[PDB]
Amino acid sequence: MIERFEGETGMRLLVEALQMNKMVRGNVKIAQELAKKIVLEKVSAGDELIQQDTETNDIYFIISGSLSIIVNGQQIAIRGPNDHIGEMAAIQPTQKRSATVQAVEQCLVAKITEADFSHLAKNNAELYKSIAQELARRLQERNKLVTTHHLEHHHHHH
Amino acid sequence: MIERFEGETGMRLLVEALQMNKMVRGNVKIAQELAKKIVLEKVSAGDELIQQDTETNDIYFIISGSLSIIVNGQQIAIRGPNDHIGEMAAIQPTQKRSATVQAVEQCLVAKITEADFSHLAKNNAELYKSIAQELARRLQERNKLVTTHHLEHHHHHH
Ligand SMILES: O=c1ccn([C@@H]2O[C@@H]3COP(=O)(O)O[C@H]3[C@H]2O)c(=O)[nH]1
């Protein structure tokens, strides 16, 4: 789908794409500035765009496809069109990637570096706000009960 | 407690407890302005500062004491001094309280209205960034609980 979004002719639909992103929420100003600063990447199915406990700090705006969020071997969510990933490392200068993010399928993403993002968010506070809202949602979702497994051990030494 | 932080005499100790807040991160200008627009309240052991599915939207900076965070009858966290509460209902303005907040002992909290907080934060990007950062930290701790395998061992030796 890249070719639709590439170049000056692609900009009309690149800006609208980024307007639909949950972190942008329709703001043309942020979308236009974001459009100037992102780089388009395709992601192969099964690719780990982000790996847990690595020290990348890029943010990805998901235009197309979907990705597994995996912590310590277990999937805890999936993220699809108009979602974002990598914001947690981008707003915390000393935190490693909290999760592996793996393409369930072929995806198209807009990548922005921490340096370009922090410079934009500096004077577009509402990006920090909209990130907070997303993190609030992830926090408020399906707490359920963490199971304790009970084991009885009969130990024999040789 | 409240005596220490009230009036001109108290302002030095009030600003100091405020600039120590997880949301203020040592910034003096923000602490000084916060102080100008908070009301100190004593919260008593047992008193529900905030009730789940209620529609208050004040933010509280915890200066002294600690409080239970409760979702549908059962606790999920404790917030101590330098924490805050009610920050989500000043980030999602159309949303009821997500949790009850019951004081575990006598507390001194600083209450600011949504109106005053929003006005302050609007020209002070860092408050929204600070909120995002603490929500990211809390989601990290949750990723860890949810994906940690919890095991209860009973060992018999022969
Ligand atoms: O409950 C959730 C839902 C989504 N995520 C994402 O995993 C990403 C991993 O890298 P990061 O730490 O820079 O950013 C993270 C988030 O975007 C998560 O960690 N937990």
Residue numbers in the entry:
A (entry chain A), B (entry chain B): 1 to 158
Study authors write:
3’,5’-cyclic uridine monophosphate (cUMP) and 3’,5’-cyclic cytidine monophosphate (cCMP) have been established as bacterial second messengers in the phage defense system, named pyrimidine cyclase system for anti-phage resistance (Pycsar). Until 2021, scientists reported that a group of bacterial nucleotide cyclases, which utilize UTP, and CTP to synthesize cUMP and cCMP, defend against bacteriophage infection, proving that cUMP, and cCMP are authentic second messengers controlling anti-phage defense in prokaryotes. Upon phage infections, produced cyclic mono-pyrimidines activates their receptors PycTM, which disrupts membrane integrity by forming transmembrane-spanning pore, or PycTIR, which deplete NAD+, leading to growth arrests and cell deaths, thus protecting the uninfected bacterial populations, a strategy called “abortive infection”.
The structure of PsPycTIRCNBD–cUMP, solved in the I4 space group, contains two continuous polypeptides from residue 1–150 and the C-terminal His6-tag, which can assemble into a dimer, similar to the known cAMP receptor protein (CRP). Binding of cUMP stabilizes the ligand-binding pocket, promoting the formation of an additional short α4 helix. cUMP also causes a large structural movement of the C-terminal stem helix toward the ligand-binding pocket, producing dimerization of PsPycTIRCNBD. The dimerization of PsPycTIRCNBD is mediated through hydrophobic interactions, including residues Y128, K129, I131, A132, L135, A136, and L139. Specific recognition of cUMP by PsPycTIR is dictated by the N143 sidechain that forms two hydrogen bonds with the N3 and O4 atoms and the S98 residue that forms one hydrogen bond with the O2 atom of the uracil base. The cUMP ribose 2’-OH hydrogen-bonded to the side and main chains of E87 and G86, respectively, and is located at the α4 helix, whereas the 3’,5’-phosphodiester linkage is recognized by A89, R97, and S98. The cUMP-bound PsPycTIRCNBD dimers pack adjacently to form continuous linear filaments.
